[PDB]
Amino acid sequence: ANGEIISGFIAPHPPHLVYGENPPQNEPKSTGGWEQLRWAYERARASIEELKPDVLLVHSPHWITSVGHHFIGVDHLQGRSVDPIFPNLFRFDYSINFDVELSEACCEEGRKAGLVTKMMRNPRFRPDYGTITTLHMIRPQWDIPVVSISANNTPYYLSMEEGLGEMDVLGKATREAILKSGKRAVLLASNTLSHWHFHEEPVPPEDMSKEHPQTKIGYEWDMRMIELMRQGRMEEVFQLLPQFIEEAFAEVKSGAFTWMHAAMQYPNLPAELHGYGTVIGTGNAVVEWNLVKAGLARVA
Amino acid sequence: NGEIISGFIAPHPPHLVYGENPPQNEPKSTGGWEQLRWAYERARASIEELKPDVLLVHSPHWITSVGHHFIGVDHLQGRSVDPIFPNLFRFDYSINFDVELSEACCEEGRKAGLVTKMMRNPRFRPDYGTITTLHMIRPQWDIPVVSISANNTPYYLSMEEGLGEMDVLGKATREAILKSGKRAVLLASNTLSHWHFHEEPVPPEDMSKEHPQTKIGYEWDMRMIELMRQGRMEEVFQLLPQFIEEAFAEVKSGAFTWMHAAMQYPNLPAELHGYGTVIGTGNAVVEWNLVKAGLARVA
Amino acid sequence: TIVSAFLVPGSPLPHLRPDVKSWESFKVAMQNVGEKLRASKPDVVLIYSTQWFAVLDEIWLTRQRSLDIHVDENWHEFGELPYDIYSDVDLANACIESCRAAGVNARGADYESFPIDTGTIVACNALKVGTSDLPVVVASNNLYDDQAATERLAALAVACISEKGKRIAVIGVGGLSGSVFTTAIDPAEDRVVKAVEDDCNKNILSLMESGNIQALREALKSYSKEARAEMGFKHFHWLLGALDGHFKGATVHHYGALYGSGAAVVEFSI
Amino acid sequence: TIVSAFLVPGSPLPHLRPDVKSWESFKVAMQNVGEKLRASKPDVVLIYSTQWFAVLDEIWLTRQRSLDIHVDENWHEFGELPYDIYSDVDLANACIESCRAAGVNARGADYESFPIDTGTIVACNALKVGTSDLPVVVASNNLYDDQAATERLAALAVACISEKGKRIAVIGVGGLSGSVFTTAIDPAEDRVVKAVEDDCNKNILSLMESGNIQALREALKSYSKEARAEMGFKHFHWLLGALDGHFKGATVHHYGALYGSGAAVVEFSI
Ligand SMILES: Nc1ccccc1O
Ligand SMILES: Nc1ccccc1O
Ligand SMILES: [Zn+2]
Ligand SMILES: [Zn+2]
């Protein structure tokens, strides 16, 4: 019972980053694009290399579940993940190894706390495009076991405060399962900030002169929240989340951010911004809460 | 004996100061160009750890016909109003110059065959570009500055011959630094892609309206930055002319060549602190830290 | 030119769990309407499911033959749904060019492993439609397209295919009431959640069998909000658009609950 | 209406170092053209100098009274240039509004410590213009404006100002051949660099003297490139656009060298 969360990250999942990287798992070929955000993730990739995690846990908004919170429970899945909105940019062939023991643990800790939880045991299930993009941008070697958690739709079905409360319980249960696991975990919130976007796509999609924030209000909201995270004023960040989500149409309403902070026990330490960029007008920031550097977690 | 501890590409867009809202600048913004301001936050941190004794800067906004000039006055103070962006830049400056290193820099340039002059007029106004770069690299204004002008040989004579004259100025600048016993930081105050917007956005800090002016400009910027990160500087200088012609880069002024010539053209991997756009022009903050690379001693 | 029109649910519960008799009634009804659909000798089937989202351009399926195996994201514990859907590539591309001319940004979708939605898969499998001799043309659910815009999109796709001399059968895939259970229940206790929606569901179905278009539009100004209809009942608006806003009446083959949702298999008389 | 027109050099060398006989000649000629400019009894002086740059909008000086001191960026070792320039705010703002109506993005410049160029300062001090009884209206040199565009700007300003019933004296501030010396030289050896440049200057000046407008235009096809004229000779297109391409003749009050550049003081017979 010696396990602990070593780092937390806001790992956005825009498929343009993978498109622009032209890795061998992606079928489309690009001439570049979104270089600032790819350099932002290069810094996060270096943190991960020194953190040496035992498991990566992702919460994605592109795996929507109505009956509770699901966890992937098969040892391995392989297939081709084609983004349904950007199939010209993302046609990825994935081969993922999951940590079933720890996913099972998080499911048992969520039922004890009162949430509805299920284990995905189907072996032909296709993991979502967002979970695969966040994982490849954080660790493209695909050599670290994954826990994949679905995004329960209570925030869009009932009230936005009720749904976010369920994400707080989920995070509290994740921490309980991590500590008992004996493993060194890294949480990844696959969420975008401002999600106001372009209604039309630039002819060469990677033409970066057609890339800018969609709204002035969204960029401003994104800059206000990132600065607060860089100063460690997380309490104020969570006081404003409902207004940020409504005024900037934020993708942190899925619950990954609240789940990640609840599992870290809502820390008020300064976050390191790895970088920020727009992807079809949406605001995407790579933010990290390195608890090994804070002294709250042990070094490798 | 002295040595260069770090070399940085340090752009001079007045928008960055405008966005920061320091006490020295009269107009106030509501924000803006945050990704480039965070880039300079990381550069400032290296300057706090490097602890240099003098900052040397080459600026394209101090153009001179007769040779290369060096400010040679004790201190200058007054107000600098940008002629193109006076709604964003009205800075009250107070700068202290390293007179002795400037005189040595002027003496070594004359020895190498360049034409040099010292600026001793106490009512001279230091250029807006030099003031912007210095405030974004060290806003405490507590490090002596050596200000060098940009000789117009690059636009008046040839262009490879003009950059050759900047190579000579950099070698002479290193000769003076080595005999000074000071730890120096060079600041090439240059932009990359310089195709820009012909019109300004009504709220100037409306980042909704900020994007690269051309596709080829950004593409040329990314090619040259990635090359700088890999350490392929020899290939970077072979592509400099084509980059300057095709992307209208502001490295044609000569600070880039001046700085790398004084570092003896290192092929060490550079560190990109960040890249952003300012009315369509490409701006990178990039650092060659000779201390962390074990070729210059620590503080 | 439009020779048949049907509304079928998109839940996979009736095709993955037919041991539950409550859910088995939809499979049979769906199997029955396919026989009636096939009896009208259509040349192509126009499908619009609520589970296939589009966000930028309007998407049209254009893969000649899309052969794969799908596992539902919510009902992954009941099995898988293999499919072999053949599309009319010429007609689908003609619909992409028809939107473009009307100012509607459109593009095709022809990629291997493209995520076809569960609703389109079960409707094609249950109605034995989307085959080599009876292919389909599927339009996506753009989320920024409102009820009125969906009628215009259905109206445009029918005119386009009608002018090529083809006989069209049109299906709208989607449910009725949208409130569903959010906990694991025993399938025999299934019933539509609130009674308001049950009466609302019963009332709107009643107007469809009567052929009262005028009264149907009056009921449609509150039905979507009152019954918490799935996707604002845009899949019925798709059907309306292809019938030019009028049908003589309809035959409800079955109306029931699907995990709290209100579902129905309806057949329209042209 | 236009009442006087002059071309004067923008170098500060005649005013900072008038102990050099060769450079003092331009100073006294410039002092003489101000006397002739005040004899035309103008109500405003319209000035365009090559050293005041604009890169976005066209800038008009709208500061009522601009009182300051300026040290040349190149000739800082010879002294400082103090100035007290009063501008006609109403007329400057009228030109801003007139430009906007012709689709020329324009704005004003009313800021304390704003950087006025060395050329506008020495022209206002030597010709004794820009005072309280004789205000000035200064237009900037947009670098994206060409010769044709510069003539249109002058006509725009001369039309706008003539409608308010003001007599205008117009000045273009700039040199002729632009090849300077790039080394420190004895001022007593100042001469024009290349003889070809020397000859072109004398030729474009003789065409002015005789008012041969047709031959001047022909010469202007090649003068800027052959003489490496300052700023594409745009400041002379400012004068042409203000006179509508016609004048009767000209008086050359002085021609010579200023650190290798060609420079002249020219009064124009309207
Ligand atoms: N899914 C996604 C796609 C593009 C940009 C941002 C996003 O969150
Ligand atoms: N001077 C300047 C101003 C704006 C953008 C880029 C620049 O180099
Ligand atoms: Zn998303
Ligand atoms: Zn510049």
> Residue D244 forms beta bridges with which residues?
none
d(CA D257, CA D270): 27
- The conformation of residue C87, written as its DSSP 8-state character, comes to B
D contact test, residue of B59, B110, B123, B148 with most D CBs within 10 A: B123
Whose C-alpha lies nearest to ligand 1, atom 6? A14
Residue B206 backbone class (left: φ over 0; alpha: ψ -120 to 50; beta: rest): beta
Q: Which domain holds residue A134?
A: 4-294
The H or E element containing residue D24 is helix D21-39
**A295 in Cβ contact with A268 (< 8 Å):** no
Domain presence at residue B278: no
Helices marked H in chain A — which ranges?
Answer: 16-21, 35-51, 100-112, 129-138, 154-157, 160-181, 216-231, 234-247, 256-263, 291-294
The H or E element containing residue B283 is strand B281-289
Q: Do chains D and C meet with 3 or more Cβ pairs nearer than 8 Å?
A: no
Residues in A touching B208 (Cβ below 8 Å): 212-216, 219
Look at residues C101, C258, C269 and name the one whose alpha carbon lies nearest to residue C190. C258
In chain D, % helix, strand, coil (3-state, to 5) comes to 40, 25, 35
**For residues C7-42, b (16+ Cβ closer than 10 Å) or e, as one string?**
bbbbbbbbbbbeeeebbebbbebbebbbeebbeeeb
Measured between CA atoms, how close is B107 to chain D, in angstroms?
15
Residues in A touching C52 (Cβ below 8 Å): 84
Q: Which of residues 40-99 of B touch A (CB under 8 A)?
A: none
Q: Do chains B and A meet with 3 or more Cβ pairs nearer than 8 Å?
A: yes
- Which residues, in sequence order, are CB contacts of A124 under 8 Å at separation 6+? C69, C71, C80
The pair of three-digit structure tokens given for residue C58, joined into one six-digit string = 């309007």
Measured between CA atoms, how close is B175 to chain D, in angstroms?
23
Task: State whether C114 and A126 contact (CB < 8 Å).
Answer: no
Which CATH number covers residue A274? Answer: 3.40.830.10
Sheet holding A282-290, edge to edge: A117-120, A69-72, A146-152, A55-65, A184-189, A4-10, A282-290, A272-279
Residues in B touching A215 (Cβ below 8 Å): 208
Measured between CA atoms, how close is A93 to chain C, in angstroms?
10
Domain presence at residue B294: no
Helix D195-209 / helix D213-226 crossing angle, nearest 10 deg: 160
Which residues are near ligand 2 (CB < 6 Å)?
Answer: B 12-13, 191, 250, 278-279, 281
Residue C252 backbone class (left: φ over 0; alpha: ψ -120 to 50; beta: rest): beta
d(CA A21, CA A42): 11
Domain presence at residue A299: no
Task: State whether C114 and A87 contact (CB < 8 Å).
Answer: yes
Look at residues D109, D237, D98, D258 and name the one whose alpha carbon lies nearest to residue D163. D98
Domain presence at residue B233: no
Q: Is the CB of residue A204 less than 8 Å away from at least one CB of chain B?
A: yes
Domain presence at residue A281: yes
Give the torsion through C-alpha atoms of D176, D181, D184, D186, to 10 deg. -60
Report the neighbours of D using a cutoff of 3 or more CB pairs below 8 angstroms: B
Pairing of strands C168-173, B90-96: unpaired
- Which residues, in sequence order, are CB contacts of A218 under 8 Å at separation 6+? A193, A194, A196, A248, A249, A281, A283
Distance (Å) of CA B92 to CA B24, B82, B116, B155? 5, 12, 29, 31
Domains in chain B: how many in total? Answer: 1
- Which residues, in sequence order, are CB contacts of C108 under 8 Å at separation 6+? C59, C60, C61, C62, C92, C93, C96
Q: For residue B294, with 0-12 CB atoms within 10 Å meaning exposed, 13-18 middle and 19 or more buried, which class applies? A: exposed
Note the ligand closest to the C-alpha atom of A198: 1
The pair of three-digit structure tokens given for residue C161, joined into one six-digit string = 């295919």
d(CA C152, CA C106): 14
Domains of chain D listed by start with CATH number: 2-269 (3.40.830.10)
d(CA A34, CA A46): 19
Give the torsion through C-alpha atoms of D223, D229, D231, D234, to 10 deg. -40
The pair of three-digit structure tokens given for residue A203, joined into one six-digit string = 């002819």
**A286 in Cβ contact with A41 (< 8 Å):** yes
> How many A from CA of B13 to the centre of ligand 2?
4
- Which residues, in sequence order, are CB contacts of C228 under 8 Å at separation 6+? C177, C178, C179, C197
To one decimal, the resolution in angstroms is: 2.9
Q: Where are the beta strands (DSSP E) in C153-269?
A: 168-173, 249-258, 261-269
In chain A, % helix, strand, coil (3-state, to 5) comes to 40, 25, 35
**B39 in Cβ contact with B273 (< 8 Å):** yes
Residue A125 phi/psi, 5-degree rounding, is -65, 145
- The conformation of residue A255, written as its DSSP 8-state character, comes to S
The pair of three-digit structure tokens given for residue B69, joined into one six-digit string = 């000039």
Look at residues C207, C224, C75 and name the one whose alpha carbon lies nearest to residue C148. C224
**For residues B245-267, b (16+ Cβ closer than 10 Å) or e, as one string?**
ebbbbbbbbbbbbbbbbbbeebe
Residue D56 backbone class (left: φ over 0; alpha: ψ -120 to 50; beta: rest): alpha
Domain presence at residue A135: yes
- The conformation of residue D229, written as its DSSP 8-state character, comes to B
- Best mutation site among B213, B250, B252 for ligand 2, i.e. most ligand atoms within 8 A of its Cβ? B250
> Residue B288 forms beta bridges with which residues?
B7
Half-sphere exposure of A176 toward its Cβ, with a 13 Å CA cutoff? 16
**C172 in Cβ contact with C127 (< 8 Å):** no
Q: Is the CB of residue A216 less than 8 Å away from at least one CB of chain B?
A: yes
Cα diameter, chain B: 52
Q: Which of residues 83-112 of D touch B (CB under 8 A)?
A: 105, 109, 111-112
Helices marked H in D116-212 — which ranges?
Answer: 118-126, 147-162, 195-209
> Residue B10 forms beta bridges with which residues?
none
Domain presence at residue B18: yes
Question: Residue B64 is nearest to which of D74, D79, D183, comparing CB atoms?
Answer: D74
Q: For residue A249, with 0-12 CB atoms within 10 Å meaning exposed, 13-18 middle and 19 or more buried, which class applies? A: buried
DSSP characters for D61-103?
E--SEEEEEE--SS-TTS--EEEEEEB-HHHHHHHHHHHHHTT
Look at residues A287, A289, A288, A283 and name the one whose alpha carbon lies nearest to residue A14. A283
Secondary structure of residue C4 in the 3-state scheme: strand
Look at residues B54, B79, B82 and name the one whose alpha carbon lies nearest to residue B147. B54
**D153 in Cβ contact with D238 (< 8 Å):** yes
Residues in C touching A128 (Cβ below 8 Å): 73
Measured between CA atoms, how close is D178 to chain B, in angstroms?
10
d(CA A196, CA A217): 10
DSSP characters for C187-221?
GGG---S-HHHHHHHHHHHHHHHHT-HHHHHHHTT
The pair of three-digit structure tokens given for residue D118, joined into one six-digit string = 């060395």
Q: What sign for the dihedral angle of Cα D193, D195, D197, D200?
A: positive
> Residue C177 forms beta bridges with which residues?
C229
**A193 in Cβ contact with A252 (< 8 Å):** yes
Domain presence at residue B166: yes
Distance (Å) of CA C264 to CA B251, B288, C30? 70, 69, 9
Look at residues B135, B77, B72, B131 and name the one whose alpha carbon lies nearest to residue B105. B72
